Amino acid sequence: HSSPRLFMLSSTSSDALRQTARQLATWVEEHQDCVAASDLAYTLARGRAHRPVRTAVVAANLPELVEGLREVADGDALYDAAVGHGDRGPVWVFSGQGSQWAAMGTQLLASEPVFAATIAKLEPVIAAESGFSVTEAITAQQTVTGIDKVQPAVFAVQVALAATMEQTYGVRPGAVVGHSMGESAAAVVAGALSLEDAARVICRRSKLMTRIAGAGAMGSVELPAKQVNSELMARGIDDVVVSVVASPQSTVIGGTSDTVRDLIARWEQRDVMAREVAVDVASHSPQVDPILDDLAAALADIAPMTPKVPYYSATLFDPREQPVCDGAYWVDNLRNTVQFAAAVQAAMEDGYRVFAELSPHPLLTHAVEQTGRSLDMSVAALAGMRREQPLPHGLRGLLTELHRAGAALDYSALYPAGRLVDAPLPA
């Protein structure tokens, strides 16, 4: 087929990668009439041991590839070395609310059949539970609004991104990490809950949250949580708590609207990077106390299962402990402080270095990097999607970035068959 292909090439330095690109362009130009584009793509991906400094060239024909390789060979770009050693899969990071955007699902519904099939599966469940079309919501001219619509819609995108990456691109995650509502998608991917039970969890939890919409406020501050807690106790504040611990230098507070606003005003004045976060309900604070008995009742039938993938819980007090995702877990999930930094840190201490955020737009990339920096580790924090990013080739770009970063993946998914070819082998 004269369709565009992904040609991988790697080396030990940026300059040696250019030398490899020039040698390959010269070879492809001399043997273009003898080599099939598909066989060369297969050989480069599955017949070569990928070295640390990686790149890939997209091309529909061999003369197009020679231009793309010569572009690399003649350039002056700095190619970052892979952070992972191809031994562990990526850690999927599922962030909370706030990533949603207008017609976020349109391009992936068209370019990714596994994304469309997962949305199709979810459609009747979300329709029965929350009373709306998740397909109309993720393809609308306006951004999804209302906690009862936002949470099911963002969850649906997260889960459909994970299924595409596993089924279509051969990317089995090494571990999962969720941040607040991101834990429903994390639990489906890890195998702790079925897609349907996890959709029931997000639909029911968001319907109950609409009863308390308006109660409380949240704020982000660039201070460590130990410090923030000291300030609250010192000031005599009992109605505002630490809601999220995202990074060793970043904290989210939550509680009554007035006190949160007062705290942000005085932190801003002291040149500390404070900011009220737009949220309908102040979660992970006593503001959610009224709906916790009702939530437990709604999730009484939810059937948890033993996670088949390492799940770094931000709800549990030990993130390395494996969750029992019953109704009690999801009530603690809503009320307890999101210990995201602790979970990311445990995954990094355990050896994971490639993190990819499967969400409509990246909310935690900066937090993952701050945890890596604090541990003096070189990590990769990738975004699956960005707001208004064109995706003509679906998630093939994320696949390239995962490969470039050194995440372990099954190369027989994107390059299923072909002939090994006598292309050059660099010394």
Please list the residues that pair with 6 across neighbouring strands: 58
180 catalytically annotated: yes
What residues contact 49, with CB distance under 8 A and at least 6 apart?
Answer: none
* Given 130, 180, 220, 250, the catalytic residue: 180
In this structure, the number of other CB atoms found within 10 A of the CB of residue 171 comes to 26
Under 8 Å between Cβ of 367 and 379: no
Query: 339-356 burial string, b = 16+ CB within 10 Å, else e?
Result: bbbbbbbbbbeeebbbbb
What span, in angstroms and rounded, lies between the C-alpha atoms of 84 and 80? 12
β-pair type (311-312, 175-178): parallel
What span, in angstroms and rounded, lies between the C-alpha atoms of 370 and 379? 10
Greatest C-alpha distance within the chain: 79
Task: Write phi, then psi, for 327 (nearest 5 degrees).
Answer: -55, -35
360, two tokens: 């409509």
Nearest Cα to 57, choosing from 85, 20, 94, 82? 20
Q: Tell the CATH topology of 217-277.
A: Alpha-Beta Plaits (3.30.70)
In this structure, the number of other CB atoms found within 10 A of the CB of residue 21 comes to 22
Query: Which DSSP symbol is given to 152?
Result: H
Length of the chain: 427
Instruction: Give the helix/strand (H/E) hosting 68.
Output: helix 62-74
238, two tokens: 């009992």
β-pair type (380-383, 354-357): parallel
What is the stated resolution of the deposited model, in angstroms? 3.1
Please list the residues that pair with 175 across neighbouring strands: 91
Query: 252-271 burial string, b = 16+ CB within 10 Å, else e?
Result: bbbbbbebbeebbeebeeee
